[PDB]
């Protein structure tokens, strides 16, 4: 069947064919005068994709962090877990200040001109929600991050209670929330199946209404991701191995297969048996990598910082505004903190792009924001490839360092 042949086709080879045929059609219709037809006919096939991406940002964020923070064992994270969560806190501080520097050296969105701050004691006091249901009903991503982590921790204090009724009740609540999380992981597969038509429509009406300087500046955001990404490999992981004695040249020759696997499959959780194979081939003992790789699958803020350091700068310069370094540090550190614990799930790109509109602060009713937010939702697939690639090699680096220290 034709529908079965269309679904059976792989997704990463489908969004790219959607994107190329979007850009070509939007150029050859944007030049030939037929452009008001695109905004009335093709644009609602992309607006539904933008709404489908924002439909599932909140149940993923709640039901993923509850079932994630209810997996924390306080006796498992004794010595190796502390070294890991100090390592990722060190590497995230390099990734933020390198994704900001590479967004500053490039100018993503300089010539796509289409055409008020709370204090630091207010944001950290607005993290705590006054109403958790009201934090879910509104947008309020970071309050439901906080309430989800608190509810996730407070269940494992009940599941090992001396009682049985509260233990059975806590198990049933955790299983219901885990079922909601798996349902929202199953929905994102159908949304990504719809994604070629949506990316086609979005980039088609963008190239139709603007022209060729969109692809001129869109071959700049991808460049500012990727040359900051390889630089974050060569200036962080290549020196963190050379400090701890392990030669980084043979490290890449070992981890090339896991890097290419994570590049193609576009998901760090799925490429885990390939990733543990390289860890076994590098002489790392079973317990070490068996603990650290499923931890680095979930909590690893390396690619998200490199993406949102340049995506927020592009969505700010494309909208006409202008940002300083101390004014965008407090936005990059907000988006990265909002995407915590939810970067290895299949719904990571949804939250990474929904924390861009909340980074601007303008709704999706104004046509200038909706014409610049689609421009990054076009190339999020090409960015997600390198994002997963730099996540997986960072996982391998943090396993190798801790294994060298323990051995």
Author numbering: 2 to 116, 126 to 417
Can you provide the manuscript's text about this entry?
Sodium and aspartate symporter GltPh is an archaeal homolog of human glutamate transporters, which clear the neurotransmitter glutamate from the synaptic cleft following rounds of neurotransmission. Briefly, the transporters are homotrimers with each protomer consisting of a centrally located scaffold or trimerization domain and a peripheral transport domain that harbors the L-aspartate (L-asp) and three sodium (Na+) ions binding sites. The crucial conformational transition from the outward-facing state (OFS), in which L-asp binding site is near the extracellular solution, into the inward-facing state (IFS), from which the substrate is released into the cytoplasm, involves a rigid-body ‘elevator-like’ movement of the transport domain by ca 15 Å across the lipid membrane. Here, we report a series of Cryo-EM structures of GltPh reconstituted into nanodiscs in the IFS and OFS.
We isolated two distinct structural classes of GltPhIFS protomers after symmetry expansion and classification without alignment. Thus, we observed both Na+-bound (GltPhIFS-Na) and apo (GltPhIFS-Apo-open) states. In contrast, it flips out toward TM3 in our GltPhIFS-Apo-open structure and the previous GltPhIFS-Apo-closed crystal structure. The consequent release of Na1 and Na3 leads to a restructuring of the NMD motif and outward rotation of M311, which now packs against the open HP2 of GltPhIFS-Apo-open. The guanidinium group of R397 remains between D390 and D394. In contrast, the helices restructure significantly in the apo conformations, particularly in GltPhIFS-Apo-open. Only in GltPhIFS-Apo-open, I350 replaces L347 because the HP2/TM8a motif, particularly the HP2 N-terminal arm, moves outward. In GltPhIFS-TFB-TBOA and GltPhIFS-Apo-open structures, the transport domain leans away from the scaffold far enough to open a window between the two domains that connects the interior of the bilayer to the solvent-filled crevice on the cytoplasmic side of the transporter. We observe excess densities in the opening, suggesting that lipids enter the space at a position structurally symmetric to LipidOut (LipidWindow).
